[model samples]
Target: TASTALKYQHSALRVASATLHRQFPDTSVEWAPDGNVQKVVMDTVPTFTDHAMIDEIARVSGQQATLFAFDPAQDDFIRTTTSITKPDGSRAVGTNLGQDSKAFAPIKAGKTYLGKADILGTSYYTIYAPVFNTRGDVTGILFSGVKTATVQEAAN
Candidate 1:
């Protein structure tokens, strides 16, 4: 039974991978478990401790649903470990660290970033897009996290 469910999850993940590939045709996109980021993050930031940055996004976005500027610099965009909101207007107790994430950082300097976050476990996909200001800088990052579970049966 577990294997069957896992197989279903695998297929769903494949579909998501394909979608990401098609949508980001120009970019080399990859799909892997969130843990896959461990190595990459370690290589990129080494000892990144942007607690303030993470706190800000969670506070601003979680409350107002989106915030943009912060330059997405080395000190910005931290992983959300705990907390999750569900579709039924309910919330889930998340682990101390977020296990599933879809984040875009260092968004092109001048171009506005239009994006959404897909948090798998909580079962939703929230979409967001923010306009940028002059100086070729991002004025804000608009984003939402939505759960598709009750709206649509979770794949697995």
Candidate 2:
């Protein structure tokens, strides 16, 4: 039953990604006039409203939620927003290394990415959805992951 719960949790994460694409459609990288990276703008908003969006996703799906914006200046995406908070009471933003080639390849191809990962003694059921702009460019990535312990707790 633990396996089944995890499967269901992962399914919700996938759907959440898809629905999020509809709500916060833009994940485009924004730059200042000085040719410097500024931040991501979602759905014409100056910045993503994370407390409502990310926090709701985290609560409803029981997953760690984040948005990663593609940085043309770098080879990897960067964590741009999240519901996660660090022990120091800061928002867990701008610190995570986004998807690697393994997960990113499919996303770049306009498809969704689903996989599992084990890191630093924690295991995750991860899913990534591409945020495409009107021109069909993937400007942002949506991430949802279930901690394995959450599944285990449900089993018990």
Candidate 3:
């Protein structure tokens, strides 16, 4: 079961969410898309991302770590912490996912999502947990992901 293989991914998400909630008691997301793109401005960025803790989470858990900001205006979650692009050199940041994201329903339900999904054109075994505000409102999500190949290879 993926439960066994991804235990660390689950752990990573838990701690990462805790780390974020410590700093940003409230998360604020606002954007208005003209077409498929929207300009966003945030008063503060998460310290965990600024300190590169996501990189360490990936290292310790063998999962790729990233943060997503939820936009209620469009019922979407934007990949705000990643700056990677295809080797072909194209835009990647500002990537947004809506209902297609496995995390969508889980986030809305205030639960965790453990599933497989393709991200950035690559398959991943992903786990997502919701980030909350001091007032208990969901603000965003913390993602921990491992490439499917890695999981398959380890199991084999």
Candidate 4:
């Protein structure tokens, strides 16, 4: 039953990624020919409005959520939004990292990535999916994970 719950949660992540892609269809709109693709347009940038839907996905799916936007020019990924907050009472956004993180492998390989991670002394089953833009480019990623307790609760 726990396994089935995990499967369902993974599928939920796929759906969430699709929703994000639809919300930000023009992934390259802010790109410059000089290889600058990290600019976030003030008007079109994702904010709490976008994060709210993602937060709901995490809540209903019993999973932790993370959203990232990829910068092809720099080969980096920025934490666009997350369902969880940091210790400093701020949303865990704006942190940029490379593709080496397991959370980013799905986008790097243009597929889904499923794995386990230890968070706060609990193990979690996480799934990551690539968010494709209108042109079908992998411009973003969506991740959701369920802890053991969460899976068990869903099973019951």
Candidate 5:
């Protein structure tokens, strides 16, 4: 259990770094978090679920790697990567979900949020961190999650 947790942590760190750098690149052209910019980034950012690192994390951590981008117009988080669910669930790219999540509190406060989220009617223990743009504004959130039962086992 401990070893698995370590692997999970390592993988999470790698995935988080990869995502942060890949999305928040230091470009000379100042980018705004507008519709066109958001659309292009979402369309171009690495697919976490399909990524080899994420696959390994899922294998070792009993968790899933997820990435969500903030949509200012909708005022909600949109899942940008493939995940574990039906097309109605997993392939919900461009869909605004996680609106009511408490994690947003910390994210908006410029901090990482760790808590529970219910997705597709199933509950999960999730860790979320704010993603900033070149302008140093919060533009998205990165998520990694394990099952609630798995979390409880480690806690107890």
Candidate 6:
């Protein structure tokens, strides 16, 4: 029997921010993509699955009450602050999950790529880019989404 070690590439964002914050104390740390202003931030803590963490973020950071801006880029989506409610709400964080609203048009599989929106309702500025085999041909993009309602709020 042979035991194999699976190699995992740790993303530099989480660790670096934590270490720096711990040492620096008050200075704000940020992680933006190659070419864009990062509004959303994610990390490895209670784990990405923790719903409570979101509520915490809302409590700490103000909630969105105004309309935000949505500028869809070739490989990214940009949103401006819509508004901040006192209690906080949810971020424009959702999969094209059920597609109940015609608002979100899913990128059909087998198709090369299509445009879509995430619509951050009451959450923070976060982005999720999926990783693929770089050696292989690039297929699709991995990005966080914003909601139409959030967009509307920001626009107004």
What lDDT tens digits, residue by residue, belong to model 3 across residues 103-129?
788877877677887787788777776
lDDT per residue as tens, model 1, 1-156: 323332233333333223323433532323357521110001121122223333344454332233223334443332222224456653322212122333443333322222334543443444333224333344333333423443345455
Q: Per-residue lDDT of 1-156 in model 2, one digit per residue for the tens? A: 445644564556544554554565554444457543333334322245445767777877766877777776775666677776777888867764544445667766766666665422466666666665655666666677777777677666
Q: Which is the better candidate, 4 or 5, if ranked by lDDT?
A: 4
Per-residue alpha-carbon lDDT of candidate 6 for residues 55-100, written as tens digits (9 for 90 to 100) = 3333333321111122234332222222222335544343222233
Candidate achieving higher TM-score, 3 or 5: 3
User: Per-residue CA lDDT of candidate 5, range 60-127, in tens?
Assistant: 54567666677778777777763445644445455555557777678777676656677656666666
Residue 75: error of model 4 in Å?
1.2
Q: Supply the TM-score for candidate 5.
A: 0.61
Evaluate model 2: give its TM-score. 0.66
RMSD of each: 14.3, 9.2, 9.7, 8.6, 8.2, 15.9
The deviation in Å at residue 28 for candidate 5 is 14
lDDT for model 6: 0.27
Which stretch of 10 consecutive residues in model 6 shows the poorest summed lDDT? 1-10
For candidate 6, give the lDDT of residue 125: 31
Question: What is the C-alpha RMSD, rounded to one decimal, of candidate 3?
Answer: 9.7
Best by TM-score: 3
Q: lDDT for each of the candidates?
A: 0.32, 0.61, 0.61, 0.60, 0.56, 0.27
Query: Runs in model 4 with CA error above 4 Å?
Result: 1-5, 14-50, 117-123, 148-156
Task: In model 5, state the lDDT of residue 13.
Answer: 40
